[PDB]
Design a protein around this ligand. Structure first.
Ligand SMILES: Nc1ncnc2c1ncn2[C@@H]1O[C@H](COP(=O)(O)OP(=O)(O)OP(=O)(O)O)[C@@H](O)[C@H]1O
Ligand SMILES: Nc1ncnc2c1ncn2[C@@H]1O[C@H](COP(=O)(O)OP(=O)(O)OP(=O)(O)O)[C@@H](O)[C@H]1O
Lengths: 314, 304
C-alpha cells in the first residue's frame, strides 16, 4: 500500500464560487485536510509498475517548504487526478495579472530567490526533473512561500498526441531544444529547467505579458515556428529599459543559449542572485513579515482608492 | 544629565492626527500647553528612563521640544489605526483568536511597564494604545509626569477626555497624574469590555447616558457595582467574570496584572499555538479579511 490512492467513495465534490483568483475584474476542493486541488488525467487505465509505485513514493518523499506536497492521485475506473494541496492567492501569472497590485522589484528579488532555492532541491534528489516549468505553474501561498506544481508525473501527464496547435499556444515556455525534435522526454533536461526559468524570469522581470518583442508581436503558431526554425541572429525579448537592471538581463541572456555548453548552472545563478541582492537581508522570517506587511499596505491603498472613487462617483 | 540624547531641539525636524518626520523617521508629535517649562532633575531622570527602556509590546520615545515657541513629545508613528479607532469602524472583520491575542499583548506590555524605572502608566485610556505594521500591540502616554497638560479649567470639555479614570482617582480630589495600580487594573478592565463588545466606552445595554451623566453615576457611590454589562452569552463567562473581578470599587481585591496573566493564560490554553510564528499568522487572517472586503465592495460598486 502506497497510501497515495484516495478512493472516490469518501472524498466529496466540495466546491464553491469563492475568490478563485482574488483579482479585480481551477477546481479547488477539500478532503479531511485543508483546501485540496485536482489535476485530472485522461488515462482510462494505468498499470503502475513498481517503478510507477516508486515514482509515487518519491513524489511523496520530498517534503519541502517550497513544494506543494501531493497526497493521493486517485485511480478511479471512471476518474483520475492528482490531489495536490491547494494554496489560495492565485498563481504568479495572476500575481501580476492584476495591474492593480503594486509589487516593486524587492518582492521580485525575493520571489526569484525563493524559486531558485526551491529548484535547487527540486532537481538533486527524489525527482530528476519535471520539464513543465512555467510562470503560471507555481502559485504563491498564504505567507508568500512560492511552491512548484504538477511535477514528477512519471505517467500522469497529457502524453497523448493532441491539439498540436494549442501545443504551440502553451509551448512557448520550453527550450528551443524541445521544439528541435519530435519527442522530447517528458522529464525535461536540466538544461530545459534552466532555460524555462529563463522564460519565467523574463515574465517576472518585465511587467508585460509573456515574451513580447519591441514593436513586434507574432502569434503563438508563427513565433513557435520561427523559434524552432532558428535564426543566426537568435530570437528573444529585450531584457528591459531600466538602466540599473542589466545584470538580470545578462543572467537571462546566459540562461537561454543556442547550445547547453554555457547554459549557466543554478549554483552560479544563485551566486549572481546573492551578488545582486546588495546585502538586502540576513534574516529568515523578517523577509516573510516584510512581504506580508507591504502586501497589506497595497491592499489598503487599493480598497481606499477604488471604494472612495466609485462611492463619490455615486 | 549631560548625555543630551533626548532633546533634538527641533532644529529642522521634518514636517509633513498631526504626523511629521525626523531624520527620515516618520514620527508623530503631540504638543503640551505649558509655556513655563525649565530644568528638572526629576524630569531629567524621567527622560533618562524613557530613553533607556524598550520591549517587544511597548513603544518608545524619540524627541522632546524644549523651545519656548513649541513644546511637544515626539514618538515613533505606527501605520495601522488606533485600537479603539480600528475596531470602531465595525467593518474590519475581527474575530475571537485575534481578539484574545490582541488582549494578551497589552497585558504583557503593562506588566513589564509596572515594575520598571517608572511605575504603571495611569492615563491608560483605552483609545491611546495603537498598532504597528506587523500588529505589535503598543502603548503611549509613557510616563512623562511633567509632560502632561495640567489645565483644570476645561470643565465639561474635561468630562469629554476623562471616562476610564478611576473613581477612587476621580472622587473630587486633586488627581495624581501617575495614577494608581488599581487605576491600571480599572483601565484594563474597561478596555477588555471595549474589546468584548466593540461599541465604544461604557456601552449601556438599553440606556442612554451623556458623559456628564456617566461621570455622575460613577460618583453616585451606588451600592450596586454598576458597570457596562458583560455581553450575555455562553461562549465564555470567564472573560466577563475577570472583568467583574477587576471592576469592583474596592481597590484591594482588584487582582494585579500577574494574576491577570494567570487568568488570560488559562483562557489561552485553547490555542497556545506559537510565539512569533503566530505573529505571522495574524496578518494572514487580517489580509484575508481585507481582500474579501475590497473585492466584494469593488464588484458591487462596479455593477453600480
Ligand atoms: N496550487 C494549485 N493547484 C492547482 N491549480 C492551481 C494552484 N494554484 C493555482 N492554480 C490554478 O491552476 C491553474 C492551472 O495551471 P496550468 O498551466 O498547469 O494549467 P492546468 O490546467 O493545471 O495545466 P495542467 O492541468 O496540465 O497542469 C493555474 O493557472 C491556476 O489558475
Ligand atoms: N504611535 C502614535 N503616536 C502618537 N499618536 C498616535 C499614534 N498612533 C495613532 N495616534 C493618534 O494620536 C491621537 C491622540 O489623540 P489625543 O492627543 O487627542 O489624545 P491623547 O492626548 O493622545 O490621549 P488622551 O486621549 O488620554 O488625551 C489619536 O487620535 C491617534 O489616532
Amino acid at each position: 500500500s502506497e497510501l497515495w490512492r484516495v478512493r472516490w467513495e469518501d472524498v466529496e465534490p466540495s466546491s464553491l464560487e469563492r475568490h478563485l483568483r482574488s483579482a479585480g475584474s481551477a477546481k479547488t476542493a477539500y478532503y479531511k485536510g485543508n483546501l485540496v486541488a485536482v489535476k485530472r488525467v485522461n488515462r482510462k487505465r494505468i498499470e503502475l509498475t513498481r517503478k510507477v509505485l516508486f515514482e509515487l513514493k518519491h513524489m511523496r518523499d520530498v517534503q519541502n517548504e517550497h513544494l506543494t506536497r501531493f497526497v493521493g492521485a486517485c485511480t478511479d475506473p471512471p476518474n483520475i487526478c492528482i490531489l495536490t494541496e491547494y494554496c489560495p492567492r492565485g498563481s504568479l501569472q495572476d500575481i501580476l495579472e492584476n495591474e492593480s497590485i503594486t509589487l516593486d522589484w524587492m518582492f521580485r528579488y525575493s520571489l526569484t530567490n525563493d524559486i531558485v532555492k526551491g529548484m535547487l532541491f527540486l532537481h538533486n534528489g527524489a525527482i530528476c526533473s519535471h520539464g513543465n516549468l512555467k510562470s503560471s505553474n507555481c502559485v504563491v501561498d498564504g505567507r508568500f512561500v512560492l511552491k512548484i506544481t504538477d511535477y514528477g508525473l512519471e505517467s500522469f501527464r497529457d502524453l497523448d498526441p493532441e491539439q498540436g496547435h494549442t501545443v504551440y499556444a502553451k509551448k512557448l515556455w520550453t527550450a528551443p531544444e524541445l521544439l528541435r525534435m519530435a519527442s522530447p522526454p517528458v522529464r525535461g533536461s536540466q538544461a530545459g529547467d534552466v532555460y524555462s526559468f529563463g522564460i519565467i524570469l523574463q515574465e517576472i522581470a518585465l511587467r508585460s505579458g509573456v515574451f513580447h518583442v519591441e514593436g513586434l508581436d507574432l502569434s503563438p503558431k508563427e513565433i513557435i515556428e520561427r523559434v524552432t526554425r532558428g535564426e543566426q541572429p537568435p530570437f528573444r525579448p529585450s531584457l528591459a529599459l531600466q538602466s540599473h537592471l542589466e545584470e538580470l538581463g545578462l543572467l537571462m541572456q546566459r540562461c537561454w543559449a543556442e547550445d547547453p555548453q554555457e547554459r549557466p548552472p543554478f549554483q552560479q545563478i544563485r551566486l549572481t542572485l546573492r551578488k545582486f541582492n546588495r546585502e538586502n537581508s540576513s534574516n529568515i522570517l523578517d523577509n516573510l513579515l516584510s512581504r506580508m506587511e507591504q502586501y497589506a499596505n497595497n491592499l489598503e491603498e487599493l480598497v481606499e482608492e477604488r471604494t472612495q472613487a466609485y462611492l463619490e462617483e455615486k
